[PDB]
């Protein structure tokens, strides 16, 4: 069987993909080495010691795969190498992994002879596991987008950081709250009041999160005014779709909001031609196993359209569909899907599988 190490399994990240690999037994596939970075399982800094696997699963981070992955190439190591982090993303010699909808990207790439795999952007990756189909068929000309991001999209500590939040806000009024007869003026007056106290806890985000929202994440791009987030629209849904030479336009804002692990998004889509929207449905629908296609309808959307009905599964449903005022041509939809699942480990874990095979 295949040797494989795996970097950084112990993190959020990894924990999900270690987590999901025991649910459908991929250990019994191969053989698993499991690494370290503590000085208190092997060193995951040891070149000599990563040589010998035949595959490197890393979840650990940019910085020590910046540092360790050239060193290792350095020796001539020949490799395959599994990236949760973003640093290779835009390597030539480097391909991101989506394969429910860049299997053929994934397949050529393999026999061209690339050895290095990495997943692609959470909202990037949710928005193609959602609207596959429209690009399966040559129908989008392009997309503006407007994102509600998790916290868990930013780390560990910021997904506590909101829940805390959310506490002292209720805190802050708890027994005005248990009282029926009780201003509700009076009540925001002081959450709001909390909400700016030098003690509210923003640490991590850098501004209130809970009970609020900060329409910026990552940092500014001079060059297109866009942010390093909005920029992975355009970049990575064109990389994964492996249409470099005729690049969809992807654009919009990303925005964070008070949700723990999914992201939703709301697109406005300009389709090429115009089609039944009936027709696009069952278009989206059939893509992959995992899309799901919820009718315009109040009732089941607010029960199956929100990060609370998708957080944890693998479920990406695609809702709110309809033709926009200014054409047939435009058509709108929202999306919700776990931002650590089929935004981080799931495809991790399922080219693995492959490369196992």
Sequence with gaps: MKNVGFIGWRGMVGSVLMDRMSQENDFENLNPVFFTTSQALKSAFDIEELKKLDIIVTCQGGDYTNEVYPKLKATG?????????????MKDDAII???PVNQHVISEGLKKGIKTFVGGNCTVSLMLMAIGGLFE??????????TYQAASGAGAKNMRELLSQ???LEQAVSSE??????????????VTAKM????????NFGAALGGSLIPWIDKLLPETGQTKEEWKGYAETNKILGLSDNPIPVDGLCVRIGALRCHSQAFTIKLKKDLPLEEIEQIIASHNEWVKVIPNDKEI???????????GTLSVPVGRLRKLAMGPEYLAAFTVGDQLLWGAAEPVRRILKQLVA
């Design 77 to 89: 190591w020949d490799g395959y190498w599994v990236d949760a982090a973003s640093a290779l993303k």
């Design 137 to 146: 068929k040559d129908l989008v000309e392009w997309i503006s987008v407007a």
């Design 97 to 99: 992994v989506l394969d």
């Design 301 to 311: 959307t607010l029960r199956e359209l929100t990060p609370a009905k998708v957080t």
């Design 166 to 168: 959310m506490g002292l």
């Design 177 to 190: 709250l248990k009282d029926p007869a009780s201003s509700i003026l009076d009540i925001e007056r002081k």
């Design 196 to 203: 700016r106290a030098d003690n509210f806890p923003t640490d």
